[PDB]
Write a protein that binds this ligand. Structure first.
Ligand SMILES: C/C=C\C=C\[C@@H]1O[C@](O)([C@H](CC)C(=O)NC/C=C/C=C(\C)[C@@H](OC)[C@@H](C)[C@@H]2O[C@H](/C=C/C=C/C=C(\C)C(=O)c3c(O)cc[nH]c3=O)[C@H](O)[C@@H]2O)[C@H](O)[C@H](O)C1(C)C
Ligand SMILES: Nc1nc2c(ncn2[C@@H]2O[C@H](COP(=O)(O)OP(=O)(O)O)[C@@H](O)[C@H]2O)c(=O)[nH]1
Ligand SMILES: [Zn+2]
Lengths: 83, 208, 99, 385
RNA sequence: UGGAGAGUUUGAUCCUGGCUCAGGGUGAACGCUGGCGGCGUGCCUAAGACAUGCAAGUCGUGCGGGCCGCGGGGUUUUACUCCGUGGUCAGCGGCGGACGGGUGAGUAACGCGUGGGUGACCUACCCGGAAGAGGGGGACAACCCGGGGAAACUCGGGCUAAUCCCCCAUGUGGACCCGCCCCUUGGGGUGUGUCCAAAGGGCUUUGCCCGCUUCCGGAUGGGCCCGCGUCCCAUCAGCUAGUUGGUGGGGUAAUGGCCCACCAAGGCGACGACGGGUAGCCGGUCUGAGAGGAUGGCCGGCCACAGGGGCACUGAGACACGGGCCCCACUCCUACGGGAGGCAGCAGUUAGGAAUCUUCCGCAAUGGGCGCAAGCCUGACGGAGCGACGCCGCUUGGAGGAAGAAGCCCUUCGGGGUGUAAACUCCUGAACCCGGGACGAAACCCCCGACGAGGGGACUGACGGUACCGGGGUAAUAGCGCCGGCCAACUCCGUGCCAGCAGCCGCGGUAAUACGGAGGGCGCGAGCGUUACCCGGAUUCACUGGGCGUAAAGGGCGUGUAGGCGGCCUGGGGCGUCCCAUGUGAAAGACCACGGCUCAACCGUGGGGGAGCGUGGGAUACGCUCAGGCUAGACG
RNA sequence: AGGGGCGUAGUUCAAUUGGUAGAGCACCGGUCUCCAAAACCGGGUGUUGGGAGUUCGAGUCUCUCCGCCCCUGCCA
């Protein structure tokens, strides 16, 4: 089913993921359905994570199954936090 | 890598007295003060009328020999200067000047550029705190270059920082003689560098 | 040398044989109905045709004919059958065919 | 479906010799089938093997002939002792001679003469007479002929007893024992030389194979040091230049070896090397250990007629074939101003000019053969080129 | 924000015109030479043949057994061994093996690009909503026993469990025939008549968690159809019987001659049908002032194939790379009756070739499948290795140091050159040495709170004792091409149309800046040359941007088919055309700004272009079209 | 690795009568010319594939090597 995972970009020994709502089957770095954010696992910049608030939620409210370590980031971005 | 070899030999060939030694190339024997003619077995013979090509080739060689850069690197800068906005003439010179190893020489520290290179390469220099050993490092505006602490005692940093008592630096670079510093205030201009080189004639060399 | 793929082949032959039969039934049972629907056997026609129609939606339950494949087979039966009865002979027992 | 090889008992290289059509080739097929009962898992040289109860074995069954010398002579240098075969039907025939005198020239220590074809024409003298002519022939070539384990027995019969039923323990044949007599008495008398595994790697090449699915394999007896998978080596000699690669396979008698030490015919798959790219006369060694050379000076001694050699001498500009290891390359002779008439029995120091580059190295010995006879022998002095 | 030309036809000149060169590029290969690192990248040929090992499994929280170690001995002892609980070998059942990974053989085609259509369709798992889950019967494995067999495995009798199978009911609802209303290709509503549902599993148990069933909608992914676009030969000109249409059927999820009866004679073609050759297409890439030209390797999308060829089964999906059946070729085993396999998966071999890598380490990260979860599997992937194959960075030293050693080379025998070069003196300290030593990893999970939000806690690193930092620390690699002109760089000797050079013009016949060496010089440098191919220069296929009297080029001349082109005034249309809005134009790449690895190369974030084509709205000069009028063309 | 063949001037070929090496094309000097071609004078121009062995002497008869062709060999 549709999901919300991380597609690896950057280069060797320099990971730079792109948080996206692709489709389960797509290859990891294949054609995705929509970019909603990115994540710099080495926080080598005062912005190692950004996410589309309105959008992440949209996809969630329609069947997008967040990846394990993916959700971890959506959460930290304040996706679920309903107050 | 970089040239490495008889240098006043180039001071000669090119016609214009070049400074590739700092101290000597400044005395009564830069060779251009003894044999102001090309090297080799001929050198002092009837110089035929230089072909339009020769002229440019020489002009370009002159410029690139001053900074002791390799043709590869040298070209890239030029090509790089083209794409960028503004007269390629100046821009090129600018970039050329922003070269750390050279910025060092420009601020004292090093008597020559061949020496200035070994300094940057062996550590002794610093950029906004951390140290850079890449001669090709490109210094931007607002950056302060400085000798390393462990270096501040070396027998050379002294003399070379000593002769800097008085001698002012380019209107695009400041200098704290006591606290081995220096800032790249502004990007140097065609004028500021009284170089014995015709840029808009070197730009011609890279066409046909 | 081998794999638990086999578990799928064996499993394959089995259910291949399951709906293989469920299928041929609907067939022999669909003809038997029309084979009468034109004789005039109005009553026992719908009787059988009503049986056939069951077995059809039956296979549809599982991976035999799922959806429309069943719907269609029906339309064509409750079509050919009726189209043969009105070939002289009112529809006796209510049967499946909607009056 | 391959199987590993585990070490414990010492290794040793042997190989039957003797006159053609005597017994060598079959007794070998005998010794093998024999030591395979009490030991579970057992025109061109045939490296084959059998393991007793005290040591591991190689064994070379060289064809032998005034035609296949070259092939033969090689295998000799690679062994620590030969099983000189002799037939009770004929005796010390010419080939038997040739082989011994040759087995001597190529170094080689001790011999274990096996009197095959004993089961034929019963004679009081014959059997006992032979033991004489041999010891007379062995010393006639300065061998310890008056003290060389002389076992007697008929191999042919020994073998045919094995084809009936595989398993056959000690002496269950007044026959299957003279073999156990030679086989047993063989691991005796002929010791175990000093194998130095401290020196840099170097293994001359005997035969080269192209193992389907794996690549080119180079077989030879490691002359010093050791090699395991992942070891870098150099193929030095006979080529444009010395090609370098890494070893990715080492095996003992068709079996996965772990670290093949010095003194053991091991095969080695070489990383990415085509077959026409590796041949004999080459040597696999440690990077930097030894280089390719053409010209050199050597302290050669020229045998006198008496000992085979020439009997007329040779002047400067002579073209013989020099043997370094598994090789035999030709070369011109050009030396000192004078030393011209260098007739038989001299210790001159000339200069060779081989037409094919071979892994020379000051300290290495060699031999010279011209006209079907070892005209001389010596050692590499100083290297010119 | 973007355009350079030169050599060569002549005694000389101008023109025409071909040839050749300087530029950039490449998955390269070959020669000479070769120190370090980072990031890329590496069978272009035989879609040849391939040893071996691995590349796809997972659930006992679906079910019944075998078997091993242990709670307590059913009885009172090892009896009908209940069951306790964690294991393990299959079996049954389920979800995944249709993804991910490889290749470019085929294919000139709705294959692909692009924009649309589907009132002609499907979509497992994932969300949202509705209503349910009540009765009942049965089978086959496994296991016990018997049997044939070399093996792979196979046959027979008989127990048995389920979320396996079947019958009945409930009918929220859905399917089908007919009638009706709306609607318009088969969509939506309604009435009457038939037909159709479902499975229990774990708990911390009138409640949860995981499932099950029928329906509706969302998502995502797809099928089918359509307009326009997509190479060479016309020395290939006519092609067509399921052929083109129809009617009724079969078939499919669905349209369709997709398939089949029967009927009708059509359908296609110089706007290039049919046939032959070649080729996967695209985003892009190289070049180019641009327009173009060339190309389609790595990365991303689509298609096609899985030894050659045909076929169906299971299934939400395959006519299925590590599933099945059959034929064929080839490889191997055989107890000769039948057996086994398919690297265009990773790695490795061999053959072919000018030529293209380790049978490496790890699931730590990202991603996938199954699982409540723990977790298992993952040659996807993250890494390391080999190769100057490429791009970027770095080193082989720095400052002193003679009207200037030697050696070698010239020499008008005074001297000039190599040359500050060396030596020598100081100075720094690539390597190496000792010490410290990561980022990538915070979630699954546990705990407080409701296992929600939020807060807290624990484990986990293949690369690697690597990067990087500190301290110590030795002067420590240089080659290749070229020097007649084009084209930067000249002298001596040898050679004597020889030997040889040569991209073009051309050099060599006894004073050769052209051959070979030397001295010297120029160019570039861990490289430098060579060959091959593409663009450029070549306005030399000329749309931009050419030509035909004599340079190559006017058809031998009429008449005329298709086609192209079309005077003056006015009005309708608004197809071309032009304008505005809007949808599309994926990502990466390119460009620009700023950042992150000490720089750069690489890399991230953001920003701006954009023809095409769909839609709605508008303009009407010109073109077109319709209509009316005109007489300057033309005809009478 | 082992069999069997071939190898003579620059080039095609001679002495299977074992006594130094000979023929045509070709080439090299001389006259001549700027240098050739032509004409005229005059010249064998050889690692008999190498190196050894017999022989008083070897192209020839023996060996052992080199390169090339051809036939078989060859999974640690
Ligand atoms: C000989 C072939 C290859 C050699 C290869 C190399 O040799 C070696 O270099 C070797 C190193 C010393 C070497 O150089 N070998 C090279 C040389 C070595 C020579 C050594 C030892 C001697 O000493 C003088 C030694 C044999 C000596 O001779 C005597 C014999 C005399 C015989 C006379 C002949 C007689 C009666 C006879 O009937 C006879 C005959 O036999 C043949 C033909 N026709 C005849 O009518 C006696 O027996 C002594 O023992 C190494 O061994 C290498 O490792 C190698 C094996 C690779
Ligand atoms: N008389 C006899 N003949 C034997 C014996 N051993 C072997 N043979 C035979 O001798 C012949 C040659 O034997 P082979 O092994 O070929 O000897 P090689 O090959 O010359 O070493 C064959 O026929 C063998 O069977 C034996 O002990 N006695
Ligand atoms: Zn100077």
């Amino acid at each position: 089913m549709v999901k919300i995972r991380l597609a690896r970009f950057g280069s060797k020994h320099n990971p730079h993921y792109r948080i996206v709502v692709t489709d389960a089957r797509r290859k990891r770095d294949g054609k995705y359905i929509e970019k909603i954010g990115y994540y710099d696992p080495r926080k080598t910049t005062p912005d190692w994570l950004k996410v589309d608030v309105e959008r992440a939620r949209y996809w969630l409210s329609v069947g997008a199954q967040p990846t394990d370590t993916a959700r971890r980031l959506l959460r930290q971005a304040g996706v679920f936090r309903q107050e | 890598g970089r040239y490495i070899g008889p240098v006043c030999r180039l001071c000669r060939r090119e016609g214009v007295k070049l400074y590739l030694k700092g101290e000597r190339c400044y005395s009564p024997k830069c060779a251009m003060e003894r044999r102001p003619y090309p090297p080799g077995q001929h050198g002092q013979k009837r110089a035929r009328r230089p072909s339009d090509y020769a002229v440019r080739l020489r002009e370009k060689q002159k410029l690139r020999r001053i900074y002791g850069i390799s043709e590869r690197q040298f070209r890239n800068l030029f090509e790089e200067a083209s794409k960028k906005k503004g007269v390629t003439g100046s821009v090129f010179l600018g970039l050329l000047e922003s070269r750390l190893d050279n910025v060092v020489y420009r601020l004292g520290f090093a008597v020559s550029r061949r020496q200035a290179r070994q300094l940057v390469r062996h550590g002794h220099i610093t950029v906004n705190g951390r140290r850079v050993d890449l001669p090709s490092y490109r210094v931007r505006p607002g950056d302060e270059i400085a000798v390393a602490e462990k270096s501040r005692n070396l027998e050379l940093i002294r003399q070379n920082l000593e002769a800097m008592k008085g001698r002012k630096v380019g209107p695009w670079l400041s200098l704290d003689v006591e606290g081995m510093k220096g800032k790249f205030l502004r990007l140097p201009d065609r004028e500021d560098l009284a170089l014995p080189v015709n840029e808009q004639l070197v730009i011609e060399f890279y066409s046909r | 040398r081998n794999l638990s793929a086999l578990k799928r082949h064996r499993q394959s032959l089995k259910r291949r044989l399951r709906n293989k039969a469920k299928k041929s039934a609907i067939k022999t049972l669909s003809k038997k109905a029309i084979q009468l629907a034109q004789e005039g056997k109005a009553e026992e026609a719908l009787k059988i045709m009503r049986k056939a129609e069951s077995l059809i939606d039956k296979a549809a339950k599982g991976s035999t004919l799922h959806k429309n494949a069943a719907a269609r087979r029906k339309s064509r039966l409750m079509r050919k059958v009726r189209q043969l009865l009105e070939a002289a002979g009112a529809p006796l027992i209510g049967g499946g065919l909607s009056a | 479906a391959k199987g590993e090889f585990v070490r414990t008992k010492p290794h040793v290289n042997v190989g039957t010799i003797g006159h053609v059509d005597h017994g060598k080739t079959t007794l070998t097929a005998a010794l093998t089938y024999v030591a395979a009962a009490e030991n579970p898992n057992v025109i061109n040289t045939a490296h084959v093997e059998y393991e007793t109860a005290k040591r591991h074995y190689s064994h070379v069954d060289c064809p032998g002939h005034a035609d296949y010398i070259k092939n033969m002579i090689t295998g000799a240098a690679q062994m620590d002792g030969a099983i000189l075969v002799v037939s009770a039907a004929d005796g010390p025939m010419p080939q038997t001679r040739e082989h011994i005198l040759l087995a001597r020239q190529v170094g080689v220590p001790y011999i274990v003469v096996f009197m095959n074809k004993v089961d034929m024409v019963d004679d009081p003298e014959l059997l006992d007479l032979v033991e004489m002519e041999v010891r007379d022939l062995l010393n006639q070539y300065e061998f310890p002929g008056d003290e060389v384990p002389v076992i007697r027995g008929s191999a042919l019969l020994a073998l045919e007893q094995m084809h009936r039923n595989p398993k056959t323990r000690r002496g269950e044949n007044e026959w299957v024992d003279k073999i156990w007599e030679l086989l047993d008495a063989i691991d005796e008398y002929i010791p175990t030389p000093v194998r130095d595994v401290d020196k840099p790697f170097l293994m001359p090449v005997e035969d080269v194979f192209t193992i389907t699915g794996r690549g080119t394999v180079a077989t030879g007896r490691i002359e010093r040091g050791k090699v395991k998978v992942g070891d870098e080596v150099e193929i030095v000699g006979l080529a444009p230049e010395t090609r370098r690669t890494v070893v990715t396979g080492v095996e003992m008698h068709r079996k996965t070896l772990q670290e093949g030490i010095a003194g053991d015919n091991v095969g080695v798959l070489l990383r990415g090397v085509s077959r026409e790219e590796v041949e004999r006369g080459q040597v696999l060694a440690k990077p930097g250990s030894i280089t390719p050379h053409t010209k050199f000076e050597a302290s050669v001694y020229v045998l006198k007629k008496e000992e085979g050699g020439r009997h007329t001498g040779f002047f400067s500009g002579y073209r013989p074939q020099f043997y370094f290891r598994t090789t035999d390359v030709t070369g011109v002779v050009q030396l000192p101003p004078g030393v011209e008439m260098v007739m038989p029995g001299d210790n001159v120091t000339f200069t060779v000019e081989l037409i094919k580059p071979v892994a020379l190295e000051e300290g290495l010995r060699f031999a010279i053969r011209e006209g079907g006879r070892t005209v001389g022998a010596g050692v590499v002095t100083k290297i010119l080129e």
